[PDB]
Design a protein around this nucleic acid. Sequence first.
RNA 1: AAUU
DNA 2: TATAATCGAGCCGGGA
DNA 3: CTCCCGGCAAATTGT
Lengths: 157, 85
Amino acid sequence: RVEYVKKERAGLRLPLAAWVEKEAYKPGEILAELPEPYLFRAEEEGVVELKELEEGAFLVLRREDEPVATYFLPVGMTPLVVHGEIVEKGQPLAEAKGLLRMPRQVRAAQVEAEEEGETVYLTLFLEWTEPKDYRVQPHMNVVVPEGARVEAGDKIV
Amino acid sequence: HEIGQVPLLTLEEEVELARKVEEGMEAIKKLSEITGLDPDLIREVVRAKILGSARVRHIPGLKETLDPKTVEEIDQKLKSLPKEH
RNA sequence: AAUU
DNA sequence: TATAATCGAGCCGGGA
DNA sequence: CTCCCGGCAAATTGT
């Protein structure tokens, strides 16, 4: 199983009274607490690329094949859209209910925040690992040790 | 009774050993190129250290008498190689 | 197996 | 030189 | 005690 390192930048919008101010979020850390359920809505029109992690999700809107927006749904936020769904500006992507926190496997390094009306839009610099499994057949040998660091092109088996 | 003390190989284990042997012969071939030493002489020196001090004797085809003096010299010349060699 |  | 084969089939005295 | 090894007549012939 290779856990691949992905470092990206994805946005989120929350009420302002409901979010806890921090410069970074450790995994599991409480991100915001919502008095009542909140609907996180699309700020762009596009087709939905849904990427679900163990807990938490990534959501990506694209016109043509060029991504126009990257959203992050932490834990406590249930996607209301399915992969390949057409959305218009303003339609709810996910409902956020109660306490929402960073997922157990994914972090938040630097956090920039802009304030508009009664909401904050977080620009998040996120780092996480995506697992991929490989089956090793009897005539194959693994040439790499447990915990090794590999770049693109390095031989594993 | 003595043979029954060596367990039979798994399909994986069989391939690993067979693989290591092929790769090992190839290593001896390269060590010949790098060093300019007879492939058999290198092979006998490698083999000498694996089997241990127990077996050290003159080998026919080889031009040199194979004794701890020569096996230390030749092994020490092999250990005088750069890390990648 | 014989002979003494 | 290449399917795979993996554990056999007479009585007697004397000395350690 | 038990076992393990050493002994156990000569010459001759014959298929």
